[PDB]
Amino acid sequence: IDDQIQQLLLKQRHLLSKMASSMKSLKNCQKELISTQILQFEAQNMDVS
Amino acid sequence: LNDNPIPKSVPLHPKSGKYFHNLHARDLSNIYQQCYKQIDETINQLVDSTSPSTIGIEEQVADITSTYKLLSTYESESNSFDEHIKDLKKNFKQSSDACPQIDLSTWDKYRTGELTAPKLSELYLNMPTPEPATMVNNTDTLKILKVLPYIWNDPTCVIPDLQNPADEDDLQIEGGKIELTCPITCKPYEAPLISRKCNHVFDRDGIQNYLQGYTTRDCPQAACSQVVSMRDFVRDPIMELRCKIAKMKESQEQDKRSSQAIDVL
Amino acid sequence: LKDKKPFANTKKTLENQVEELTEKCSLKTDEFLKAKEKINEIFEKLNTI
After folding, report:
1. Which chains touch B (3 or more CB pairs under 8 A)?
2. Of B159, B206, B213, C11, which is most buried with the most CB atoms under 10 A?
3. CA–CA separation, B218 vs B228, rounded Å?
4. B182-235 maps to which CATH number?
5. Residue A41: which of B25, B263, B177 has the closest Cα?
6. What are the residue ranges spanned by the domains of chain B?
7. Does B31 contact C at CB distance below 8 Å?
8. Which of C11, C38, C42 sits opposite A15 (nearest CB)?
9. Identity of the residue in A27, A42, A44 whose CB atom sits nearest the CB atom of B119
């Protein structure tokens, strides 16, 4: 049970690091979503004008 | 230039202004605060699941605090980014508030070339980065870290200059001389409390037995003549963290002693 | 009329641009919700561990 606790202590930190790496991708996807759409919004404003 | 039949610049229309006001940024605040809360609670369950038999805690606290500071910098720069986006949209709305009317003469003037209505394109491609300063270090989650190192030697000691924020690692943790028991109850406390003005740790039950009975009661310790109220006390999780870590170490050493007694018998 | 004909051409190309930018925004919102659901997945994985 001690070895099981030990080998499970290295898996939780692995998933924590994986979450943090995917957490860094959150900024990427939100910055690519807020961008590449205001230009198109100005384009549709030009369309309605 | 005549590359595009539509003019390179165009004023704003109320029909377009409706949708322009309809613009909104994604709710990053709630997801960021909930991921911050899950990060701090997983840090708590990490520091709870630790054991003195595990050697090599320095590298793990180093990498978790590096991840913590990285996510804090990311959250702060995202906050600065959305603030700058709000400022940019306010600039766009105030520049379009002075836009001319819509007719054929204005269309012709803007088609032949008239830098009068600046679009959001050029202001967004080369938008100035906010470069936020004054790193957020007042968060209790930033106070949670660094309490795990330098505790396996003497948990019941606190150096007086530990509250010095001069060091970059959230504190200056060193060995000193402090009491682990509450003098009012004469028993090792499990629910500690300490205020910023008194700077004295006390048991919650003891401090509530000593506080009730008088509307203005000073602290039992000396060197603080000012009165301390209920609102002055703050919940410092570092103290209870240290007490429960010491309790875990005591249970671990008792288990080790029992196992050794098993071996010798 | 020699001006209105290119105006019709431009309104056609602008509505085409609007439709393709709307489908690209739909794709970016899909990737955003995918990031959100993978965040929830790693959260529940951490809870299970």
Report:
1. A, C
2. B206
3. 6
4. 3.30.40.10
5. B25
6. 3-181+236-256, 182-235
7. yes
8. C42
9. A42
